[PDB]
Design a protein around this ligand. Structure first.
Ligand SMILES: Nc1ncnc2c1ncn2[C@@H]1O[C@H](COP(=O)(O)OP(=O)(O)NP(=O)(O)O)[C@@H](O)[C@H]1O
Ligand SMILES: [Mg+2]
Lengths: 355, 13
């Protein structure tokens, strides 16, 4: 570390990337992940004696789309208060408001994520899959009751501790159930997108999250992604190779002949028997997987029905499944939102943490 | 939680 700005901040070199953070954050510094937008590093808060996860978001305010994702991540996570949603501990105040380019979000530290666990050389029993799935659904129940769709569920966003506690993270692509818009931000993972998203449907519901949940459940059972399309056409094909090509009623939600011909130019496949494809697995699990991976979203099981599925009966308890009584009302689509006032809002959130 | 389904603790690097 090299103290700067009078000693109030310190820069650390983490594999070439410079972290500039407030002085109370000290080493050991452990790189624990890298996504499309954040580089994430564990550190110690010396004032409280805690380990924390510091996510550096470089160049957060370069364009309006990156700005909004950083604003959603912060506002949604400060809104949620739930055992299965990751909590924000701090947002570092930039040393000078005039030069505010990098955003550092300090989260509670988790041991790993579900992607790393699925790929690891250890068993994932039926109780692991049930326990992960229950907590995922439990947190989604709360998130959806706040009127929010997560929209980007994938194993690497499900943070885990060794005791199998699970927390949803990475809310930057979330939407309120009212701002449903057609545009789908680039992810490096199309593998968990519902067919409504792959086909650019502009109206869609909580069913898109349930689709991702099914992809995740299936991956926990097979230890492989179900639908790793190398592009978006290959992705649709892999889906219909498992569940069969949609009939005309299942394509009702499409809004153009263009999207219709797209789907029907694919090779047509019969709906496979899920027991055959997933033998020697839990009948409750296969049954639930088949009810989530339904092409027609209006026919997908909901979060609430999934919590009452037999597979989860060992864990299901309405006394322990709160909803959010405070709905999320911030409107990220006001036309007076610029990179510069989004910067001001986030700067204000940091003063809430560091006056 | 109930010992009937507490999953075993995960190995982590
Ligand atoms: N609080 C945390 N504790 C432990 N690990 C974390 C934490 N937050 C993130 N990670 C890990 O760091 C990686 C980056 O997380 P994430 O927030 O998805 O990055 P991102 O670039 O902001 N979003 P995405 O581009 O969709 O990956 C993930 O693979 C996680 O495994
Ligand atoms: Mg984010």
């Amino acid at each position: 570390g090299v103290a700067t700005h009078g000693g109030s901040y310190v820069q650390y070199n983490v594999y070439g990337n410079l972290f500039e953070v407030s002085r109370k954050y000290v080493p050991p510094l452990r790189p624990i992940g890298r996504g499309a937008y954040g580089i994430v590093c564990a550190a110690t808060n010396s004032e409280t004696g805690e380990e924390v996860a510091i996510k550096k978001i470089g160049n957060a305010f370069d364009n309006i789309i990156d700005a909004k994702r950083t604003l959603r991540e912060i506002k949604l996570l400060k809104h949620m208060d739930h055992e299965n949603v990751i909590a924000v501990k701090d947002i570092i105040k930039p040393p000078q408001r005039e030069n505010f380019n990098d955003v550092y979000i300090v989260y509670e530290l988790m041991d790993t994520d579900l992607h790393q666990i699925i790929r690891s050389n250890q068993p994932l029993t039926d109780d692991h899959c049930r326990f992960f799935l229950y907590q995922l659904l439990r947190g989604l129940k709360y998130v959806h009751s706040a009127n929010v769709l997560h929209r980007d569920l994938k194993p690497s966003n499900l943070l885990l501790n060794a005791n199998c506690d699970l927390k949803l993270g990475d809310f930057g692509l979330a939407r309120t159930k009212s701002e449903t818009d057609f545009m789908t931000e680039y992810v490096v993972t199309r593998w968990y997108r519902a067919p409504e998203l792959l086909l650019n449907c502009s109206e869609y519901t909580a069913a898109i999250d349930i689709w991702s949940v099914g992809c995740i459940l299936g991956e926990t059972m097979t230890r492989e992604p179900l639908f790793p399309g190398k592009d978006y056409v290959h992705q649709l094909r892999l889906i219909t190779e498992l569940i069969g090509s949609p009939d005309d009623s299942s394509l009702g939600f499409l809004r153009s002949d263009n999207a219709r011909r797209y789907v029907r130019q694919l090779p047509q496949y019969p709906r496979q028997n899920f027991a055959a494809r997933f033998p020697n697995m839990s009948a409750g699990a296969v049954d639930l997987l088949e009810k989530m991976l339904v092409f027609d979203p209006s026919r997908r099981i909901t979060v609430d029905e999934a919590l009452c599925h037999p597979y989860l009966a060992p864990l299901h308890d309405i006394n322990e499944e709160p909803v959010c009584v405070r709905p999320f009302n911030f409107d990220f689509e006001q036309p007076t939102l610029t990179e510069e006032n989004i910067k001001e809002l986030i700067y204000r959130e940091t003063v809430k943490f560091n006056p | 939680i109930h010992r009937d389904l507490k999953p075993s603790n995960l190995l982590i690097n």
